């Protein structure tokens, strides 16, 4: 279920799911580095009916994973609301900006 684009936490993922790329939802695959910055999504939890803030950190410094590509856009907005926007590389400020995969990190309620 976590490797599916329809998993509730992945509601604003644009990229390859790290959990399909040798990582997990909250760990980068070996040899790729987390982005210190991210876009942030608000996703509805279908179990408790509450809304959670999800931070979409990319993993960086390896070439494209190529697996489990997703392009979900719930509450995503254009670049004039920059930290809600997912058509940019959230690896853009990493030591190496090559994009590998995207994680879906649960911050908490809201």
């Amino acid at each position: 279920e976590v490797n599916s684009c329809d998993y509730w936490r992945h509601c604003a993922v644009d990229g390859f799911l790290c959990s399909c790329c040798g990582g997990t939802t909250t760990t980068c695959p070996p040899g790729s580095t987390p982005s210190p910055i991210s876009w942030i999504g608000t996703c509805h939890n279908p179990h408790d009916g509450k809304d959670y803030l999800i931070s979409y950190h990319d993993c960086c410094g390896k070439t494209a994973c190529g697996r489990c590509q997703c392009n979900t856009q719930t509450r995503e907005r254009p670049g004039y609301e920059f930290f809600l926007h997912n058509d940019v590389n959230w690896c853009m400020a990493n030591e190496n900006s090559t994009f590998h995969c995207t994680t879906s990190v649960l911050v908490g309620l809201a």
């Binding site: 254009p78 670049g79 004039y80 058509d87 590389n89 690896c91 190496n96 900006s97």
Partner: protein, 361 residues
């Protein structure tokens, strides 16, 4: 008997050429521009653009400009963000212009990599992730400096009625106008009133650009306008693309480079899909709608062929659409577009196509 030679020019004339920006997202370090003949679908050549290239053609039609990122060892080593100047007819590299290491890395919206109307400056989006606009002096082969006034804004809309002015869309729902001096530094600027509510009616960044105004569509199918005929930009809207029947079926816009304006007629072209709701703003087109911007009424609707991006040629009255891999060629000299042909397999992952410029002075 035979000898293999290089040094050759593109076989078809400029006026037949289009540029399909293939991100090759699956292998994004080998993005490239594919050059096609739109009249017969022939593949004419290509320009390599490394990691997430962006592309535009010089206004005078002589050069191709690309923007890309290198590293010394690709996935490690020192970063070099650049603009490259390529000869359009020979498809050969001529010059590299160094940028600060913060050029936008992202999908190929037109407004991330543009030029002034007079062609003297390249105007590009930076994100560090703080945003600013970068100015490149084409004559000098130099980066000028950041337009820091554009912090919290996004994308570049040139003003076609002025030589070196452009606008950008800001987080407050208004537009910032920048007027450059002859050296490419900011000479003056202004900020419009709020055009749209960022919270309640967010717009797509892609402009339907006329010579002295621009129209924008919203996530909910409204239209907003920025008129820059005068000293300062005047903003208006919304008006709705939708009639009751449209609204009843929840039609809304969707796509990337999703609108276009045919300037001579005032017809605006927009990708649309039914059953709109939160999260569908990048859905492929079920239909293309053709709107009269004067009467504010729809004048045609045709099948969308799952298109995501488009471009208009004012000089030949054409529209191209692009579904990610295939390019459709339309004659738009009448209110109902006519499909001429499809070029299959033009790209693996493209969200931008552009004509080689003809005329346009």
């Amino acid at each position: 008997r035979e000898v293999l030679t290089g040094g050759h020019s593109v076989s078809a004339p400029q006026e037949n050429r289009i540029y399909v920006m293939d991100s090759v997202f699956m292998h994004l370090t080998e993005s490239r521009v594919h050059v096609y003949d739109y009249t017969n679908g022939k593949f004419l050549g290509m320009v390599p653009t490394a990691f997430n290239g962006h592309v535009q053609v010089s206004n005078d039609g002589k050069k191709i400009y690309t923007m890309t990122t290198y590293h010394e060892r690709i996935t490690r080593g020192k970063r070099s963000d650049v603009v490259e100047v390529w000869d359009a007819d020979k498809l050969t590299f001529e010059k590299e212009i160094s940028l600060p290491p913060k050029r936008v890395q992202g999908l190929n919206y037109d407004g991330l990599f543009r030029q002034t109307t007079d062609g003297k400056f390249i105007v590009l989006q930076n994100a560090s992730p703080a945003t600013s606009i970068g100015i490149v002096d084409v004559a000098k082969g130099d980066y000028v400096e950041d337009v820091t006034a554009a912090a919290g804004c996004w994308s570049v809309i040139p003003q076609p009625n002025r030589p070196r002015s452009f606008m950008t869309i800001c987080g407050d729902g208004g537009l910032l106008t920048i007027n450059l001096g002859e050296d490419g530094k900011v000479a003056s600027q202004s900020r419009s009133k709020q055009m749209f509510s960022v919270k309640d009616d967010p717009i797509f960044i892609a402009p339907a650009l006329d010579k002295d105004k621009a129209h924008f569509v919203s996530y909910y199918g409204n239209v907003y306008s920025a008129d820059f005929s005068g000293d300062e930009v005047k903003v208006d809207g919304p008006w709705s693309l939708l009639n009751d029947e449209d609204k009843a079926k929840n039609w809304v816009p969707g796509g990337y480079n999703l609108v276009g304006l045919h300037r001579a007629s005032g017809r605006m072209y927009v990708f649309m899909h039914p059953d709109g709701k939160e999260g569908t703003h990048k859905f492929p087109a079920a239909e293309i709608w053709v709107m009269d911007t004067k009467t504010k009424q729809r004048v045609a609707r045709i099948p969308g062929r799952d298109a995501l991006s488009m471009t208009i040629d004012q000089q030949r009255n054409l529209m191209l659409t692009l579904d990610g891999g295939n390019v459709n060629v339309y004659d738009i000299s009448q209110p109902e577009p006519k499909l001429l042909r499809t070029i299959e397999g033009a790209a693996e992952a493209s969200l931008q196509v552009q004509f080689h410029p003809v005329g346009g002075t």
